[PDB]
Amino acid sequence: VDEKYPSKYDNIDLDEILANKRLLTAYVNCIMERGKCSPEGKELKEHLVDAIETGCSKCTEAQEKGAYKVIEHLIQNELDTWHELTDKYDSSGKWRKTYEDRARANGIVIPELEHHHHH
């Protein structure tokens, strides 16, 4: 095995997790504390939880960008999973709405918003 830092992910293996339903499901089980975490799962869980709890106040710029890549993919493609995560970690809904606004600003609007726009 050629991986000295198993706890450690970049933008590409994040893209690969986000692209596969069963990998995404496993990593989400890890972040939701209903499944065992890979080392990289633990790293992503710490940063993603901090993103929802405090807007990644404890994160570097790059760690927040990784968390937002995950959050943006969830808002567009897995809204119910996104709402599971915010129900678990967003003490009242501030980062739920802030991240949703930021996604929409980056052109990544929720499906319903696209439907109202095209109806």
Numbering used by the authors: 17 to 135
What does the paper say about this structure?
Specific insect behaviors can be stimulated after recognizing chemicals in the external environment through conserved chemosensory proteins (CSPs) in chemoreceptive organs, which are critical components of the olfactory systems. CSPs are present in chemoreceptive organs and can bind a range of aliphatic compounds, esters, and other long-chain compounds to stimulate specific insect behaviors.
Therefore, we only worked on the truncated version D18-E128 for the follow-up structural and biochemical studies. The N-terminal residues V17-D26 form a flexible loop, followed by six helices (N27–N122), which form the main body of the structure. The helices of the main body collapse onto each other and form a small central channel. α6 is parallel to the two planes formed by α2–α3 and α4-α5, respectively, but is perpendicular to α4. Two disulfide bonds are formed between C72 and C75, between C46 and C53, respectively. The overall structure is spherical, with the surface charges of the protein being mainly negative. The closest structural homolog apo-MbCSPA6 (78% sequence identity) could be aligned onto SlCSP8 with an RMSD of 0.96 Å over 100 Cα atoms, suggesting a high structural resemblance. Our results showed that the SlCSP8 protein has the highest and lowest affinities to rhodojaponin III and avermectin, respectively, while it displays moderate affinities to 12-bromododecanol and bombykol, with the former being a better binder than the latter.
